[PDB]
Amino acid sequence: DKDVLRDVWFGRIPTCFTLYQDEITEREAEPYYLLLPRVSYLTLVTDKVKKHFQKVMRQEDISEIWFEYEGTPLKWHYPIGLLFDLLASSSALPWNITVHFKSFPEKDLLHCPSKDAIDAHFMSCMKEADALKHKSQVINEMQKKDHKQLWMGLQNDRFDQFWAINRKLMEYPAEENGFRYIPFRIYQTTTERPFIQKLFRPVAADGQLHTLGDLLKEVCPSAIKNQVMIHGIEPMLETPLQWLSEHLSYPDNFLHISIIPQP
Amino acid sequence: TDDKDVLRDVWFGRIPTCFTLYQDEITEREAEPYYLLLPRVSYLTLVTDKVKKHFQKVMRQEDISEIWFEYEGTPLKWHYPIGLLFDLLASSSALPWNITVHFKSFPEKDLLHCPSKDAIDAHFMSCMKEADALKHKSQVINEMQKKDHKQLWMGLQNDRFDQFWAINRKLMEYPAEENGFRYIPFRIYQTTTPFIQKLFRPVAADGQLHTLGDLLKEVCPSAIKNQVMIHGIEPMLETPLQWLSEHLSYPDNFLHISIIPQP
Amino acid sequence: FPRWKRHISEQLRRRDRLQRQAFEEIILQYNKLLEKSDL
Amino acid sequence: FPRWKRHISEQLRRRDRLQRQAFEEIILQYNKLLEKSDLH
């Protein structure tokens, strides 16, 4: 199973960053091509983009940077993979993202905080995830130095360094035979619509393990015409939920599941 | 000129291709790979003049040797159209198509030489003349003036769709009473570059139109888990063969049909 | 129109999407940079 | 290896052929050329 973790982690998304046309440039501006980590956040991967376009604009021209796809702004705290699966799966590669330096929508999009604060959203997501899995038991026993290693493991794309700590977060007491609750979030047609996150257990009353279909039957019976997409694949609805929470989660220990129609 | 929409999407079919110079080749300077979109219907030797020149600069003024192309150890036989080569050799692999460019060690007994563009012109006409011999007992290709033959060539070489089908529409026409070509020009390729070609008529004594399935049942009975590929698509077996020879042939009026496995 | 003609012409558009539309834009920019890199 | 696990592992490789392997090498090559222009 360790092979799945590695190809989930090292997943990529070819992306084309084109400067929004409205923007004025001293000299001509090239698109920046790049492979974004599905598990990372737009917050981390874009100083290389900000720096690329830094050259062609005077200080007066430059403002806070933000990203759009097809008119809709991109949330800084949704994982890059999840954003793509939900919003751009049907379109043609590479992922065409528009880069702005003007007209930030203060009404519809959170600000890009210090890189410090995406780290905040990451750790709160892990904390919430751990609360469902363990009654918050494990992440409260880690040294602070471990929280910054989880973060810097995600940040520097070092797999084994990250999963050095994260493995403990995936373990459970033998008698329980699975997590208490599974940390998951379901997304429907757009980012703006509120995601679903309820309580649900990976082991039944009988002792048999619950599947993906059980989660969907219980939490979202509209996915049973529709496509269920996790990290760019459609796992069989007969897939045990506990295994999915263990292997197909994003680094924030959550199962970001997309519901999208065909084709 | 029946369903021009299908004809144009076939004619303008492209294949993303990566050309890398072989490592053992003596260079005066490092040579970046040449990226290109190759026309599926043209010939490898006809459309690579820009690639050849790119590597001429890096290499010494000696050698000054004929250029050849290799795809993972196998020399590419330029008599086969670019689309057929890709479909047959590299389609199941990942884009772009990775072609190695050589200049030294020409495989004299494995690959035919291509000395002039005139020689390509020669091969092309032999293929059409063979095609028409099957369709109309050589009646149409012979009754056209030589100014029409050199127009078909100049149409393929210079990628002008209208100029080509100005002449080719006659070759796709048949006597109304026969309701089909005399014989259908086709070649079926196995995994290696020895093809199969017998005689086959588009209409039976029943009067019914023969399909692609009827053809394979009588000519290549080892398909049906094989996939049948023509211009990169897998048409329904129920597809009438006469319509295929009219619309899914290459400019040499042949149905180059590749038989590949799945995945 | 008939079943097969629709089905055939669909994949031609699907094929061009998968094979041409994806690389057309990047390959064009790659070549433009390549020529510009010959000073 | 049971049905779902095999099938999941295949898509992950299928996904990498289509999304990553297709663009990694050309994007790489594109950037090396770009530095040469920035530094004219």
Numbering used by the authors:
A (entry chain C): 4 to 227, 235 to 273
B (entry chain A): 2 to 194, 197 to 227, 235 to 273
C (entry chain B): 10 to 48
D (entry chain D): 10 to 49
From the paper:
Macroautophagy, referred to hereafter as autophagy, is a cellular process by which proteins and organelles are degraded and recycled through sequestration within autophagosomes and delivery to lysosomes. ATG12 is a ubiquitin-like protein that covalently binds ATG5, and this conjugate noncovalently binds ATG16L1. The ATG12–ATG5-ATG16L1 complex functions in part as an E3 ligase to facilitate the conjugation of LC3 to phosphatidylethanolamine, generating LC3-II.
Whole exome sequencing identified a homozygous missense mutation, hg19 chr6:106,727,648 T>A, corresponding to E122D in ATG5 as the only damaging mutation within the genetically identified chromosomal linkage interval. Crystal structure of the resulting ATG12–ATG5-ATG16L1 complex indicated that E122 is located in the vicinity of the ATG12–ATG5 interaction surface; hence, we predicted that the mutation in ATG5 could affect the conjugation of ATG12. Both wild-type and mutant ATG5 protein were efficiently co-precipitated with ATG16L1. Indeed, the co-crystal structure of a human ATG5E122D-ATG16L1 complex superimposes well with the previously determined structure of the WT proteins, with the major obvious difference being replacement of the side-chain. Although the overall structure of the E122D mutant ATG5 superimposes well with the wild-type protein, the mutation causes a striking decrease in the level of ATG12–ATG5 conjugate that is formed when the C terminus of ATG12 is covalently linked to Lys130 of ATG5. We speculate that the E122D mutation causes subtle changes in the conformational dynamics that propagate to Lys130, which is less than 10 Å away, resulting in less ATG12–ATG5, which in turn leads to reduced LC3/Atg8 conjugation. Our results indicate that E122D is a partial loss-of-function allele that impairs but does not completely abolish ATG5 activity.
